[PDB]
Symmetry: C5
Subunit: 311 residues, 5 copies
Amino acid sequence: VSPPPPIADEPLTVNTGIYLIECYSLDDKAETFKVNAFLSLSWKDRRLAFDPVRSGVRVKTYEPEAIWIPEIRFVNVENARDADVVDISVSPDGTVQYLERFSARVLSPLDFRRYPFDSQTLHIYLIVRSVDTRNIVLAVDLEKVGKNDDVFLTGWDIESFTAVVKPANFALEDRLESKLDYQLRISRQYFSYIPNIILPMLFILFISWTAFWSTSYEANVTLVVSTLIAHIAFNILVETNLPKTPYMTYTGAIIFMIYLFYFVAVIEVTVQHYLKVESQPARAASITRASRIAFPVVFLLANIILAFLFF
Amino acid sequence: VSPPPPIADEPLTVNTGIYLIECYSLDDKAETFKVNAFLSLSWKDRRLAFDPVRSGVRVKTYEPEAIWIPEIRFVNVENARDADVVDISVSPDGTVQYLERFSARVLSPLDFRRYPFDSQTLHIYLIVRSVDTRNIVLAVDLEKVGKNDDVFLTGWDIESFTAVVKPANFALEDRLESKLDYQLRISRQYFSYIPNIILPMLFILFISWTAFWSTSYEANVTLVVSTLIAHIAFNILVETNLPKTPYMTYTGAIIFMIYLFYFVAVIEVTVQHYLKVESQPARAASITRASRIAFPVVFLLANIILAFLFF
Amino acid sequence: VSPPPPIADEPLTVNTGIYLIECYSLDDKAETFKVNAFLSLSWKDRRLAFDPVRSGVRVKTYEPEAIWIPEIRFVNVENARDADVVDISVSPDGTVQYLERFSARVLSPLDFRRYPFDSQTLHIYLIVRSVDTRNIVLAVDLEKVGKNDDVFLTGWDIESFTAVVKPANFALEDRLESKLDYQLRISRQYFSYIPNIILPMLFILFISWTAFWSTSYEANVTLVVSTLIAHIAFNILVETNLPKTPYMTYTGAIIFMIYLFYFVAVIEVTVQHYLKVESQPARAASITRASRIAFPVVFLLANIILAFLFF
Amino acid sequence: VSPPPPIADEPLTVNTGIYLIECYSLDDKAETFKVNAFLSLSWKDRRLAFDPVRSGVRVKTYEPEAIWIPEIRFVNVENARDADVVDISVSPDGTVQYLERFSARVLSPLDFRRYPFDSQTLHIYLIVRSVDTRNIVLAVDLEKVGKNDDVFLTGWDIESFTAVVKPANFALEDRLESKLDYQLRISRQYFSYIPNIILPMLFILFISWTAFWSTSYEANVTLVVSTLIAHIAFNILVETNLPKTPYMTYTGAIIFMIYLFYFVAVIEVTVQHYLKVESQPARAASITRASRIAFPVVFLLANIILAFLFF
Amino acid sequence: VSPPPPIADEPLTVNTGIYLIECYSLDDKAETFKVNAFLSLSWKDRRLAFDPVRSGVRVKTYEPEAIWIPEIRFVNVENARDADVVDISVSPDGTVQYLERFSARVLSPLDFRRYPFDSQTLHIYLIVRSVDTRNIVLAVDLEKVGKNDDVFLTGWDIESFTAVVKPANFALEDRLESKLDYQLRISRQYFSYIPNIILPMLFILFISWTAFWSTSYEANVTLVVSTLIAHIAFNILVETNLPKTPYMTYTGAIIFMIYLFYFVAVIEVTVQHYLKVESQPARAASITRASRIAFPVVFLLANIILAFLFF
Ligand SMILES: [Cl-]
Ligand SMILES: [Cl-]
Ligand SMILES: [Cl-]
Ligand SMILES: [Cl-]
Ligand SMILES: [Cl-]
Ligand SMILES: [Cl-]
Ligand SMILES: [Cl-]
Ligand code: NA
Ligand code: NA
Ligand code: NA
Ligand code: NA
Ligand code: NA
């Protein structure tokens, strides 16, 4: 089999569509997601044209091996898609309608700057390489782009699945290449981060601040060092669910800042004890009373500054 | 090969059945389960009809490639099922009996609201897409729906395996699609959660309340902060076995509430020490004695409220 | 190809054998094990009879596609076995000798009641479904059942590999099925559990009992709460190597009971401190001296009771 | 099919190119990375030559099975590459242009000596074996070596992708082998190691040094032992992301050295308490005051020495 | 195709060779390693002999399907090897030279008795099963046994790769079997265990011994119990990298022994406090001073005894 010949000099237009059946395994560390979808293809092959009046048949069904099919690939996949052809239909004018169901693991970079209050645009890039006989170009049939109502991505809200209708046509290894960008817009369900990480992390921090109502150095050291260790555990827990980024994330910034608050609380607890031992408790009392206001106030203002810089 | 032609204008009815051989790997985080089963299919193909007297046989055995077979797929699977055809049998009137053994990884959302005292309805969605030539509709042969007695799903009780007999017929890319819902009802074996997570979590909480019978601030700080850290460990352990949900789970609610009890216990221990240092122990004694009753009473009432809201 | 025809009315007997080459990956949580073995099959097919004089050869060698082969499957496997045909030898009367080497992941439930001093009976269920032309039945050739001397299952002792010679013949979806039960008897190597979990767990418990020779409340709180946390770590470690069971395991029972001992030790340490603060140390001394005997004695008797109930 | 015959006695030159489409999963522990790329091959086959005039075609397309194709393999791959032929074009003189898209898991050793401020040279070794008919040699077509602009390796910066143009020709199992070295130069994005591991590790160390402004032995023991345990947690965290090396890494060196600082801080805290109990506090005060300067100064100088030895 | 016929009554000798290209993933827990190698085979097939002066061709290249090839398998593999035939060459006398490149996951038991200062002998067992026509025996072509210079097994030193030239010929299920033992001798790179596990474990133990220079019971309890918990963390870390063994490992023995030292240190700290409370400090002073010498001396002698028993 060979490509359909051009009537004049025009490129062969392959109309495409992706209909999402399943979305699963959005892996933040790997920056991948798995997809199960319909891939629809349509192009004109005049060699396959027939008369509907004398044939009595409106459509002809072909097997993939019987006819020429464009070699359509995904750019951002781990391995080649696992595909099963569903149907091939030919209209009397020779317009071919191809439908396959496929599954693939897609590589799509994620922006973690606003994590866990982040939104993402996942991409599925469709591509075709031109043949020596003729140039193949891709198009979007909007009537064949969509998603099943039941499509759920655990921990995410699916906003939209659209295609950038204009392909990116470019030369690659002395041939033309036609690339389409299918975009799946999602927003993270931040809900569970509040009772599981944010509030427990705030509770232990506020517990360290009870040391500002205590003159017992031994108890103070226990309060601030124990809660610091619990903060380290939350830091480790959070960084296991995330890849290493060449930038600060919102959560990373707060987690890092809270260390400074633990460090300054240890200085305060040390300074307080040192002065009491030096028979200067009136002074220690002034620093401790100031700390009761300063620590929550600086914590609030630093969080307003951070929220402003990130959102 | 082409689909059986209609005698009048009727859709082709494909009778289906699923017989479960094995159920394994119910993954709560992934919201998947693996299944090994028989898939049975039956439909009328008049072109295959024969006379028993002339042929000298009452049944005809074909190879899948020799005859037309409907393209039946699963909606909610990760990848296409691993299937091996067991038998194809044709009766004199062209009634085809198809049997395959398959294995598949199924995606099925789970409701964790009542975890670990939850029940689930797992779904296996069977689907067929119509051809230009004719409309294909699915039906349930109840005589061919079932499960092996030895079918066990580790950590779960299997209640029933039934099929919703009327298919969900709908249009998908200008073609009729016929979808059947096979339902596997299961209930979680909550037993092990009692000695492994619930009771250890209650013991450490009750140990933190021994601080209400102690005037030693340094010992009190050690009691409440150490048990809090152990509570954080149980919180982390529990959340590793569960996905992130946009709602509160029963366990999540109790775990979160217990933080409030640790937080208020630290306030009490702080207030008690502060008053003692200020030479007001009579008062501190009133707050501590009230706390001995208030903490277990508020804990019991808050748990009754939570159990009521969730069950 | 079709099944061999009956001389009278008898079912076709397929003689079977399994020879274990490798046993590996006994996964307690998944209740699976991997196996690499020889599967031998033997049946008479008179349509394959030949004269050694005419054909020259005394035994004919065939390719699986060239002749009829019974569709033998495993019941309790995750996916269909990975098999490679080693030989298909046909003797002049038409007796077929089939040999394949296969690998499979087998689902076999485990009884954890006596863990880590437990024994198991792993099963490999062989099955064949009858066809329309004739009924197929399975048999065991004991001369072809066995295991390689070097077969080792890490963490287990292999006792025996035998087959229940009588098949379980039953009706399934209006056809006969013939099932054979191959049994691999194993016993767990409990050795490593003694220095890694049992003795460390006993040491930390005995360390908490040093609080019965101390009047220092703050040291006592540190002794009992710190060792409790280490006990929680061992509880978590043990439960990661085990599935969730709807029954108590021997280890689970001991681990759970040790929490009660930590809980009562905290009560004792609290009661002791309370009385000494109330200027009643004579009494506190009576409770502490009694505890020195009561705690090890009740611990010994409770362990004798538990060992009796479980073994 | 057989290899192209030599016009004189020359070896057959196979021109190669690798164009990277995707780079992912650089696993430090496994010392592997996954790659998705184009592999281009070019060689002259006189037997496939044609005249453009009498053929009416300027180029001829073939199926891989129709013509002779060199058996090109990768040396440093886990399993054989997953490849799909994209195009095979033949020019009039019989110059074959082969293009395949492949995916492979590549084994490439990593030098962790300067971790996390390390750079690596990943290798993809292309190989061909000679045949008895003729010697097959590899060459690099620099015009067909490159990478997509969007190629990103999470946690790394991609510097260059070049090929060593001169192949390594050598004998292997009495046949000559022609090997090409494709080099992907990368540098680690050390950014995230600063707020997640380096600064938290420095904060806990500086917190242990507050013991040099405290006379409370009980508090000092708590400060140094608690932060040491947190240092152990960071040591364990770091070693989980790295393989075991027969040399010291930069991070490993610092982590190990910080133990010495904790060990000497415990000696100081012990010596201080011992002297105070022995009624020699003036002396203990001299050691503690010296320690306030000595510990940060020796820490700075030891880090300058280490940075010098490693960079 | 059928096996080559014997000239007299001799078994068919299949000469073998394994040339290692890659060695990776030595998994201690699983007792497996992955291998990528050349497998070479050689045997005489007289039915394939040809005249060298008449034919003009000195060697004939065949496709695997065109000729008879012995069914060579690996005994100790998880799944059948992934193999790709590289070349098949026939010399005038009919000597066949077969070469394939394969990858396999090999099961090979490991002796952990001297861990992490252990050496191992990994095995690759080659096997052939005889046919009814004739007996097939294996031999080693030492010229075709070897390994690439770049073969590296992360965390190990590769000493030698040799073959036991005499096969193990035995009867299995009424046919002869010919087995060859290929041995890969390796020694563990123990280097990293010294700064990561051994020295940190010794530091925390020596820190517990500072309690012998302290009269503060509350500080002593904190020193011994905190370091014990850190020892438990190292015990757990070590046992995660190792399988469960029915014997003691060298590391396991030291780790277990160090618990006894923590247990006796707690007794000493308890006895010391008890005597001081009983107004017997002169005595407590004698026990504490003796402990300062006894603990390091008994630790040294116990380690000399252990090193002697294990090495
Ligand atoms: Cl693709
Ligand atoms: Cl499917
Ligand atoms: Cl509709
Ligand atoms: Cl329709
Ligand atoms: Cl099977
Ligand atoms: Cl390859
Ligand atoms: Cl093999
Ligand atoms: Na085609
Ligand atoms: Na068909
Ligand atoms: Na067959
Ligand atoms: Na070829
Ligand atoms: Na062959």
